[PDB]
Design a protein around this ligand. Structure first.
Ligand SMILES: [Cl-]
Ligand code: NA
Lengths: 1292, 97
RNA sequence: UAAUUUCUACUCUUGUAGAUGGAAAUUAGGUGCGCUUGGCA
DNA sequence: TGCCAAGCGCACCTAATTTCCAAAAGGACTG
DNA sequence: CAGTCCTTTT
């Protein structure tokens, strides 16, 4: 049978380790003498200047190709339409095929293999493309064929700075292939054109069509917008939304024009913005007329296109020019301030506002657009002023006050500019005072700011704050002046209008200044960055192989449990390359690694045999075999059969499984497969690097199903590591003469005083060089290691000064933390600087604190107070396995069917908890449940919330923002740790919400980290040879590829829909079945009431019972009949009950919305109240519902229905009280209503816990349905109805 | 101490009155003289003496302005510049302060 | 209120516990501020 | 205590997805 | 050239 310990060595996992390098002997001196750090820093800067210049080549060529593109998009449109309407696998595969067709068509323009062009252009293109990813960039040929464009001397100086060193760009080359690729990859121009933007552009066409059909008036409105924007003059609005035009939307310039048709164009701040289509639509919806509803019911928002890869963005909107220095902003603003002084704006403004005290307030108007801003400023609420205006006008109407008249008044207030006399009359003299007070403040602060002198730089935050407040004050005055409606439509006092407009014009630059100052001041300062080291070796540390040591300059050593990196630089003088001679292992010295690798057979074999030039040149005009002798102890035969096998016309090769899919030649497949493997074995037997490799463990060629299976077994044999001893003399002299740079590879696990557990990464590294691993490779050392230099980034400041005492964050408990609010007090107290008497709570903790005097000076941020050499080195684990797994989920599912006792860990994002776990057994009973707001005695939820608020505050205060991703990782690392221990201890499935069905970041980040961890899980404590140790990692999730490609299962991890997991009774499965949106009138509520069979009082219990059949009130339901035909809904007597800990609560309590804040509500009590007010007999046990209905009192009906809705509100929250409970309105089989307030640990302790519990239980649904299934295939999602039916049947 | 009346409404008795804002003043604790000629200390308050928890038999003379000067100088806050003190008082969340 | 390849939390311990896939390229989005036209009874 | 919709501009922070993780063939230099 | 060492490849 299967076993949990059988989840290992299923696929390769690559990782990077990071270390510090400590130079030894005269290494640092030689590095300094040779001036390598400066040289490598200079390369880095040259790379950064050059990259944009070189990028100009790609950007131009790409646009030149994309301007010529003319495709027909109908077929792709159709495939999209098929797969959308019918959701099958065959329609998908058709779209995937079509997608790939369209991509290749776009790509054909780049490579010069498109029929839509002439032979001359296709010849020119292929010629350019042939040189885009080589050093042909740096020669000028590709720029010679592209235009008569040319480069400035400085640009040529840069290009020649990478002479004999163009390989520094060999990664860049890959990044740029990723732009021009035809593959289905995000980085690529074709993908962007085909799978990103075209769907959008298609959808836009559809939206346009449907809109102008429903509402043909829009056609011209849209055309008019285009006229007003001044783009696409020769193209009518119809053509813009036709497929052929999409051929004109492949270049950035045109995409931005398209986007601004949707988007509109802003001018200077304060001026009217030109509206685009999407705004015109929004405006039309917000009118709430008939045209609005028609539009609101359709799709009413065009989708902007994504940008073209690499291309610079353009905008027709106004861009404000930047300040360049502290000095420039201070001068400008200082001048503007002086202008405002000499102009006499504050004294005019004050005189203007005074004018208001004794002038006809009928001839002063307030802008309709500002009425609500003024309300907030001068009144309790934003609607105060409107409402007072409304109510006053209503009171002034003549005749019987119809509803239409009130309607008319409301409509008048939307547009009309209101005079100040009316505003005052409606709101009261209070308003006059609030106005005068506010104008005083704004003038007072403005005056203060003009008098207050400016700082000398903006280098300190205190200085930026001086700048900010002065701008704030001036902006305040600008805002105040902009309160007044000044236009000549209203009968404004002529003087007032002229004077206001005058000082408004003088104040207008405040806007411009405010924005520019912010845009400058909130810039982040150049922080120092580590840069790559090369030591004058273009292929430095590219790969470790003995045969490459003389080119790549990097070797490894071991000596007395310590690890060293050997770098062999190219010095400035003439020196013979350094050679190392082994000796007897007894002699003192360093053990040097001899690394022996033949990379991926699949590529290297053809590279060294079939794909040779001489081979290709021979088979071009010959059919006779060719025998290779060079690097072969005996000659290797290349026959035409073999050559043509790896070099076909046909798209799939005859030995790839794709030829088996495409055709039906299983004979010829396996025959081609055998002959190729045979040939590989012939190569391996003869080639110099492989001939001595024992391949007897390989099987006979004929027994391999796929080529991958073969290469999977082969590659593990083609890598070996051994050590030989070099004498101390050779090494020390090499260091002495500067022919060797020797560094200790270091982390804190190598400290003299290290005496604890090592970092996981240390364990990987030591496991890598362990004897077991050398004999049978589990961990491989990979090439492409990198060395970095990181300059000091902080100043040395010891966290101490003299005889300071340091206060442990935890008590002698070594468990209980000191409150955040008390720490500084206790800290200042134990260092005798409190400045006041100690608080009572501090004085209570005082006896259990721990202090440590400072004997040894430890440096804050020490690691960053001096330059460091860093080293990144990649490794691969589970090396014996294939590179990707096969049918990983099936293997888990197989294991699960044979292990029905498997427990489930539900994980939930909560409302009051970041993450909440509930572990269930295989019978759906809770083993454990807890919030993970606190781990290791630290409240991460509080720390995170505080840091998020700081970051907002920073943003608003033009202060340094900083990062929160580090704190998030800190937290999630602890969480991941605890989930991993639970999984291992329980051998359990883990179940999370699918987020496709706020604080969704912290949970998304979790998902990622959890999977990455479970892809390769090593537990420090476990021995190396035990499953879960370093040489046998656990692999419990499927190999992560992308979130895009992720399904509802990744091994032991499962995703389930969140709906109906929190607001659901744990004992019955009951959910509120009603849609309260559809209960809105006296009519709807009364039909709703008529649907219930009875409501009657039970004198025994004190409860009311309301009987409902699920087949009634369908109009008001969500179409989820679940499993139960009826429910007795219960109004619980509002009596005292006691929880497990002995704390009381009131049964049946609800917490309902107020929005003042929430209100306590006792339904049963309130029902009795209603019935007693109405005088309706109920204590006999009679049906109350006919009597409420026959009476036909609408307020009694409303109340009753309001009460029903409350009773059905299971979840009841109040942050203030910390209540967040579930109380079910229905009795379980044993005749009791669930209440989390009882604090029974068998059940959910709160609402968030209930969530996790049902997350877990949805997983259980998947495991139960898997068992019953005869496949190893998990069902695709869970419909809400299936869920409810499941859980309701189970519980009852 | 400036208070807008359309503010901190959670602690108000719901009696806005007529005025929008008040400049609450901590009067300097200097000597003033009544008409008869008797001296008194301006700004003086008479507050119950409180023993731990809730115990109040006798009363005591308090001088708010001077005690504020004490509290600021304790914590090294500069105030004779005319600068706003409120942000500085709650910038570090000192419970005593 | 300190030590780290680096991060978070710690300090019996000149260090502890857990985590940690790098580099390069690209793209998408978020938060904040400013502004525009509108909406809310 | 006022938010919300559609959108334009600026600052910076965060996340997702691609390539590589190489010895040796190939050939541009450089006396 | 013949060798060296950066460039490019499967
Ligand atoms: Cl829910
Ligand atoms: Na450790």
């Amino acid at each position: 049978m299967t076993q949990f310990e059988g989840f290992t060595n299923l696929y390769q996992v690559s990782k990077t380790l990071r270390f510090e390098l400590i130079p030894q002997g005269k290494t640092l001196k030689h590095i300094q003498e040779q001036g390598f750090i400066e040289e490598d820093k200079a390369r880095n800067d040259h790379y950064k200047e050059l990259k944009p210049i070189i990028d100009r080549i790609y950007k131009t060529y790409a646009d030149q190709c994309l301007q010529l593109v003319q495709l027909d998009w109908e077929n792709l449109s159709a495939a999209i339409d098929s797969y959308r309407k019918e959701k099958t696998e065959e329609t998908r595969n058709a779209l995937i095929e079509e997608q790939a067709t369209y991509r290749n068509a776009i790509h054909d323009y780049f490579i010069g293999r498109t029929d839509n062009l002439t032979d001359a252009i296709n010849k020119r293109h292929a010629e350019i493309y042939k040189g885009l990813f080589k050093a042909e960039l740096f020669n000028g040929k590709v720029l010679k064929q592209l235009g008569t464009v040319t480069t400035t001397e400085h640009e040529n100086a840069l290009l020649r700075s990478f002479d004999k060193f163009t390989t520094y760009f060999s990664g860049f080359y890959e990044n740029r292939k990723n732009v021009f690729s035809a593959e289905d990859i995000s980085t690529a121009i074709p993908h962007r054109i085909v799978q990103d933007n075209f769907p959008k552009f298609k959808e836009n066409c559809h939206i346009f069509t449907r809109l102008i059909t429903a509402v043909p008036s829009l056609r011209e409105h849209f055309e008019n917008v285009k006229k007003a924007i001044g783009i696409f003059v020769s193209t009518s609005i119809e053509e813009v939304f036709s497929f052929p035009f999409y051929n004109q939307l492949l270049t950035q310039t045109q995409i931005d024009l398209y986007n601004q048709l949707l988007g509109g164009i802003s001018r200077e701040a304060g001026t009217e913005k030109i509206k685009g289509l999407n705004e015109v639509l929004n405006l039309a919806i917000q009118k709430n007329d008939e045209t609005a509803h028609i539009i609101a019911s359709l799709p009413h928002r065009f989708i902007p296109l994504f940008k073209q890869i690499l291309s610079d963005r353009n905008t027709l909107s106004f861009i404000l020019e930047e300040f360049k220095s502290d000095e420039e902003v201070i001068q400008s603003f200082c001048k503007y301030k002086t202008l405002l002084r000499n102009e006499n704006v504050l004294e005019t403004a004050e005189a203007l506002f005074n004018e208001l005290n004794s002038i006809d307030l009928t001839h002063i108007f307030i802008s309709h657009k500002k009425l609500e801003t003024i309300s907030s400023a001068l009144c309790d609420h934003w609607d105060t002023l409107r409402n007072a205006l409304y109510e006053r006008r209503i009171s002034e109407l003549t005749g019987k006050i119809t509803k239409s008249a009130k309607e008319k008044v409301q409509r008048s207030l939307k547009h009309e500019d209101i005079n100040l006399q009316e505003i005052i009359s409606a709101a009261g003299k209070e308003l006059s005072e609030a106005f005068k007070q506010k104008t005083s403040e704004i003038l007072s602060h403005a005056h203060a700011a003009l008098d207050q002198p400016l700082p000398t730089t903006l280098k300190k935050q205190e200085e930026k704050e001086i700048l900010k407040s002065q701008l704030d004050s001036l902006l305040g005055l600008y805002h105040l002046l902009d309160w007044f409606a000044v236009d000549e439509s209203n009968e404004v006092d002529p003087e007032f209008s002229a004077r206001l407009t005058g000082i408004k014009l003088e104040m207008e630059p405040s806007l411009s200044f405010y924005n520019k100052a912010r845009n400058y001041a909130t810039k982040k300062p150049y922080s120092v960055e580590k840069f790559k080291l090369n030591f004058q070796r273009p292929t430095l540390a590219s790969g470790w192989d003995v045969n490459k040591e003389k080119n790549n300059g990097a070797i490894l050593f071991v000596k007395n449990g310590l690890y060293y990196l050997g770098i062999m630089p190219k010095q400035k003088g003439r020196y013979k390359a350094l050679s190392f001679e082994p000796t007897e292992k007894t002699s003192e010295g360093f053990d040097k690694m001899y690394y022996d690798y033949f990379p991926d057979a699949a590529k290297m074999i053809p590279k060294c045999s079939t794909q040779l030039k001489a081979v290709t040149a021979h088979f071009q005009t010959h059919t006779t075999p060719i025998l290779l002798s060079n690097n072969f102890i005996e000659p290797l035969e290349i026959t035409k059969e073999i050559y043509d096998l790896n070099n076909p016309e046909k798209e799939p090769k005859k030995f790839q499984t794709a030829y088996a899919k495409k055709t039906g030649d299983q004979k010829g497949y396996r025959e081609a497969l055998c002959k190729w493997i045979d040939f590989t074995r012939d190569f391996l037997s003869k080639y110099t690097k492989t001939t001595s490799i024992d391949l007897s463990s390989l099987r006979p060629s004929s027994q391999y199903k796929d080529l991958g299976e073969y290469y999977a077994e082969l590659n593990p044999l083609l890598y070996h590591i051994s050590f030989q001893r070099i004498a101390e003399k050779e090494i020390m002299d090499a260091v002495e003469t500067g022919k060797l740079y020797l560094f200790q590879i270091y982390n804190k696990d190598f400290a003299k005083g290290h005496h604890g557990k090592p970092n996981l990464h240390t364990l990987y590294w030591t496991g890598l060089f362990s004897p077991e691993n050398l004999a049978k490779t589990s961990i491989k050392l990979n090439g492409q290691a990198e060395l970095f230099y990181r300059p000091k980034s902080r100043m040395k400041r010891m966290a101490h000064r003299l005889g300071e005492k340091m206060l442990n964050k935890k008590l002698k408990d070594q468990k209980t933390p000191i409150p955040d609010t008390l720490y500084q007090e206790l800290y200042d107290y134990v260092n005798h600087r409190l400045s006041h008497d100690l608080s009572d709570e501090a004085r209570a903790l005082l006896p259990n604190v721990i202090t440590k005097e400072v004997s040894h000076e430890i440096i804050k941020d020490r690691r960053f107070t001096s330059d460091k050499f860093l080293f990144h080195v990649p490794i691969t684990l589970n090396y014996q396995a294939a590179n990707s797994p096969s049918k990983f989920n099936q293997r888990v599912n197989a294991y699960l069917k044979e292990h029905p006792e498997t427990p489930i860990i539900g994980i939930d994002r909560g409302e009051r908890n970041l993450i909440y776990i509930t572990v269930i057994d295989s019978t759906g009973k809770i083993l454990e449940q807890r919030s993970l707001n606190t781990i290791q005695q630290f409240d991460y939820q509080k720390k995170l919330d505080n840091r998020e608020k700081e970051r907002v505050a920073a943003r608003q205060a033009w202060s340094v923002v900083g990062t929160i991703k580090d704190l998030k990782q800190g937290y999630l690392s602890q969480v991941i740790h605890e989930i991993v221990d639970l999984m291992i201890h329980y051998q359990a499935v883990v179940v999370l919400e699918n987020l496709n069905f706020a604080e969704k970041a912290v949970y998304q980040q979790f998902e990622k980290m959890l999977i990455d961890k479970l892809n390769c899980l090593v537990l420090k404590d476990y021995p190396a040879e035990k499953v879960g140790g370093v040489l046998n990692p656990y692999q419990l999730t499927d190999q992560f590829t992308s979130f895009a490609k992720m399904g509802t299962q990744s091994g032991f991890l499962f995703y389930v829909p969140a709906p109906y997991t929190s607001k659901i009774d744990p004992l019955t499965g009951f959910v509120d079945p009603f849609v309260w949106k559809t209960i809105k009138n006296h009519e709807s509520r009364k039909h709703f009431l008529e649907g219930f069979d009875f409501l009657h009082y039970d004198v025994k219990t004190g409860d009311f019972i309301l009987h409902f059949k699920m087949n009634r009130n369908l109009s008001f339901q969500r179409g989820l009949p679940g499993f139960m035909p009826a429910w007795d809904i219960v109004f619980e007597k509002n009596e005292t009950q006691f929880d497990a800990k002995g704390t009381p609560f009131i049964a049946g309590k609800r917490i309902v919305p107020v929005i003042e804040r929430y209100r306590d509500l006792y339904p049963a009590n309130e029902l009795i109240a209603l019935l007693e007010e109405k005088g309706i007999v109920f204590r006999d046990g009679s049906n109350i519902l006919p009597k409420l209905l026959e009476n036909d009192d609408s307020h009694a009906i409303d109340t009753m229905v309001a009460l029903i809705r409350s009773v059905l509100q299971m979840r009841n929250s109040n942050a203030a009280t910390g209540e967040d409970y579930i109380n079910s309105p229905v009795r379980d089989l044993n005749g009791v209503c669930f209440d989390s307030r009882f604090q029974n640990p068998e059940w959910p302790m709160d609402a968030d816990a209930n969530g996790a519990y049902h997350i877990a239980l949805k997983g259980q649904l998947l495991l139960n349905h898997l068992k019953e299934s005869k496949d190893l295939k998990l069902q695709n999602g869970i419909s809400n109805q299936d869920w409810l039916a499941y859980i309701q049947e189970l519980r009852n | 101490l400036h208070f807008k009346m359309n503010r901190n409404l959670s602690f108000q008795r719901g009696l806005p009155g007529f005025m929008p804002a008040w400049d609450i003043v901590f009067e300097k604790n200097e000597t003033q003289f009544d008409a008869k000629g008797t001296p008194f200390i301006a700004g003086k308050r008479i507050v119950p003496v409180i023993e731990n928890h809730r115990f109040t038999g006798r009363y005591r003379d308090l001088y708010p302005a001077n005690e504020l000067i004490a509290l600021l100088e304790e914590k090294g806050i500069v105030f004779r510049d005319g600068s706003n003190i409120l942000p500085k008082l709650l910038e570090n969340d000192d419970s005593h302060a």
